[model samples]
Target chain A: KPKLHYFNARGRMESTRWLLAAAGVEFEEKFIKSAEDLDKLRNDGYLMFQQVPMVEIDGMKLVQTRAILNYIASKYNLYGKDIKERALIDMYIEGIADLGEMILLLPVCPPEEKDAKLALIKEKIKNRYFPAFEKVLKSHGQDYLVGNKLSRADIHLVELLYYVEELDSSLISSFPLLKALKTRISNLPTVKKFLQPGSPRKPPMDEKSLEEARKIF
Target chain B: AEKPKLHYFNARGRMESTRWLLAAAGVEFEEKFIKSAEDLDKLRNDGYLMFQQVPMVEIDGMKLVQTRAILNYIASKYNLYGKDIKERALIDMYIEGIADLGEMILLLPVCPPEEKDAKLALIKEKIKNRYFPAFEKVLKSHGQDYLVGNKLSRADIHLVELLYYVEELDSSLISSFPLLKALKTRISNLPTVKKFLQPGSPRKPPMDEKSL
Candidate 1:
């Protein structure tokens, strides 16, 4: 069993967790919320840079969210149909990752400046990212992002939509397919089970942005 | 017979890795350099597929952004990824690790005109005391010929580009990592990459460096 060690948050690993649940693969979640916890990982010589989203699986410890998700997606048969399909999925997943970084790297501003920062990012997401993703959804003409089945791209898109909801709840209402896609994954039998109350999931972002996600998992 | 249209600032920033891959594969690509703020603003205003970032590749009816994704796609399409699944995973991991460090190094060159040196000093400190050692060990453990395996993967090609960029940033950057230094020499000397090194190619774009 692979053990996923990350912060006590659902930001990076939600895509992986969603994929694992949707695929019926079982793994352990190791959540870190403090310096002491990271010290243990370093003492054990786990992470290369003491970063989160590190996984101990198949006799190797891996970091980097993209690598982790790629590994798990390939393993459990949720990545895509093949190399070409996988490449398309990779493009969309990477699209979301870029957006995720934009949100993650938003400068921590003064309290008074928080709303302004959040609004700008929200607008960027609205004007820039949302349409790109929506185009993917529409072009595919399916409930999922890449192929007929639910893949990592779908899981990643869901998290971004969830992030958008955190930014502004009703903001998601505009993108009809995006909202529909969220419910498509959020309604899965195994997926709904994982999203039940009292799970280890946490907010995607911290209390920096005024839109800092509240713990809804 | 279709050439990829590589679009970015004339400078090689995030897109260099992909360009290296295309070069290594003997795939010729067309460059569309954004030379003006007006050009960039025009794209953003026109709502390009990538929105605001450069280094977007238009090929086979799909426009791809995000440098890593672009590299991995080209790698997979042409077997530059790896021979098998496990090698591909390690390749991705290694590439992402380098990218994590590269992002910090990148901040220096692209930073505010007044704040470049201070930021460069901090990046140099963290790298010398912490970052470089980890990569040196990865090289040592793996025979130093390639980053992941005996076969040269896209990760190895990315290393070649990163070493050059790091050297440009701080020439002494690779002094401690002898294995990396050797690999840098080895990769550039590869036949596919040698021509790009020759004159008439845009070696390195003037990145407002003189003022900084």
Candidate 2:
């Protein structure tokens, strides 16, 4: 079984969990509770850069979230059919990741800064990011972003779309294709299982979870 | 194969790494310089840039954007990635760490003059304390000439690029890490990299406002 090492919150590890679930892979979790926990893992020589969201799979310990995700995507055939297709998947994922970077910072954002941060994030979503994906979906006239079949880019976009909607339900209302995408991806049997109450999928960060994240990171 | 067409400012902002990878692979590419803001708009309007960003390269009958994706494509095409997925994972981890420092250096040229020294000092400290030591151990552990496998890969090339940037800050920075110092020398001595280090290459000078 693939063992995922991260905190209790979603953060960077959520995407990995989502991908694994989508691939019909079962994995165990080892949550880091304190700085001591992180220190032990580092001393144990598991983490490559003293970082988490590391996964022990195929008898190798992997650091770097993108590296881990790429390995999973490639192994499970979710990456793409060929080099050119993978490039398209990567371009979409990188752009989606750019927006997700902003969402990742929201929980740690100070109360005073949160308003401006959210406003900026909303603007980026509507103006900069969503429009790009909406264009691809509209132009391609396909359910997936890169290829006609599901790929990591589609999975990642849905994950980001859900996280984005949690901020403001109406944020995605402007992008009808993305709304359709969210629905299409969420209805997949494996993805639907992941969205269930007892699944490994995590909720939006809470105050206590935020405190834990801050302490360890 | 057709020569790759690169589009970016006539500087080493983000495209330099792509340049280094292409050069190391012995691939000569033609660059379309973005001389003004309008040049960028034209490219975006042409539907070449996926994220409407520069450092786009036209290769293999496709226009590739996203610096990392472009580099990955070039590296894979040129056999600089690795033999398999496991080795590629290691390469990815190393490059990601190298990029952590590379990103800081990339921003140094644009940093406000008042804060430049302090920013550089912090970068140096992080290098000595955090980044270099991790790499030092990796090299020391296997006593391998390369960061991964037995040959040149994107990780080694990118690390050499960052090594130059760090040396620009302080030449003595890598004195304590003998492995990294030797690795830098070894990679620099490679024929293709040596050619890139020479004058008359497409490599740009350190970023300045004029370059911007």
Candidate 3:
């Protein structure tokens, strides 16, 4: 059985956890409290890079969240069966990773300056990112990120939509199609179960935080 | 008659290709620019960001984060991934290689001047001695105009874009690899690509050295 060590927070581990659950894989989740606990795991070679969300399989450790997700998806048959679909999936996965990095940069900026930063982000997305994605979604007629059925891309899209709603409720209002799609994804029986109270992999935001965030929208 | 909307910071850092890809595909979208940290904070806390970065995309009301994920999603939808299994894998290998190169380029903006030379030199060495040779061997073996199965794919588009950046950053970075240069030139001359590069197309602002 694989052992996953990370903070209980839903940053990098949620997607992988969802994949594991969906795949029916039995893995141990060792949630740590502090840097010291993490360090102890590191000394045992079960951790690396001072990063959380480390997954250990068969005594081998892997970093790079996307890489780990890809590996697990491949192993569990959640990834595409052929090369073309796999490449497309990889491209979509990398795109999300890149966007995640940009979105995470928000907290480092000052509070008063965040609007300007967000405005800029909004522009780039409007001008560049959304059109590109819309093209893809339109091409497939809203089934999956790649291939004909549910795959890691769908899992990734679900997490992404959950994150977006938590970021800005108005974000959905602004992009109605995307919002509708997210609604479909969130309402999925498995996903809805995951988001319910006591679910192992819920969206990172607490209700209070989510309410506060909604005010900003 | 409503167009899709995109939200991101007003920079061309990570989301440039998606913009170009959209233009290439003749798709329309609304660009929303977030101008202040307050706006960013609201968005961040709301879940648009796992790490507060830019280039997140929303499609059909489904919000998607991650730049590479967006690119692949677009590529797959557009039939821009390649023809076969082996071709797709080869494209992936090249895309990964270019992504590494891009990481090196990104480091320059923040790296201290004194260490910049060493870092860039190391990158050049990796490209020349390791990446370039391997890519050249693949090209030679495939004998296709594009990296995989002769069809134009996102990998080819990305390689061309990366080479343009490398040349602009330092011409010598890619000059040593003949096959790479030829491949880049071939892609650059494509009709859809050429139109995308016409004047007024938003490209990354050139560095001072290149402008001079």
- Report the TM-score of the second chain of model 1 against its true counterpart: 0.85
**Winning model by DockQ:** 2
**Model 1 lDDT tens row, B61-143:** 66777776677778987778888778877887788877877788766656777888788788777667656776677888867
Quote the positional error of residue B206 for candidate 3 in Å: 3.6
Best model per TM-score: 2
What DockQ, between 0 and 1, does each candidate earn?
0.58, 0.67, 0.10
lDDT string, candidate 3, B1-212, tens digits: 55555677566667777776665566666777767788877877786653356667765444555677677666666778665433444455467667767778866767878998899888777666655665676677767887776777777788777777777766876766777888887876777677667775544464444322
**TM-score, one value per model:** 0.89, 0.95, 0.53
Off by over 4 Å in 3: A1-76, A80-217, B45-52, B83-86, B207-212
Record all residue pairs in model 1 with backbone atoms less than 3 Å apart, i.e. clashing: none
* Model 2 docking tier (incorrect/acceptable/medium/high): medium
True contacts kept of each: 0.56, 0.49, 0.17
Ranked candidates (DockQ, high to low): 2, 1, 3
lDDT of 3 by residue, A104-179 (tens): 5565566898999877766655544454455567777866667767788777766765665566655545555565
TM-score of chain A of each: 0.83, 0.97, 0.80
| Deviating ranges (above 4 Å) for candidate 2 | A110-113, B109-118
For model 2, how does the per-residue alpha-carbon lDDT over B1-212 read when each residue is reduced to its tens digit?
Answer: 78999999888888999988898788899999999889989998888877778779999988888888898888888889999988988898889988878999888878899999999889989898888999999899899999999888989999988998888878888889999999999998999998988999887788766775
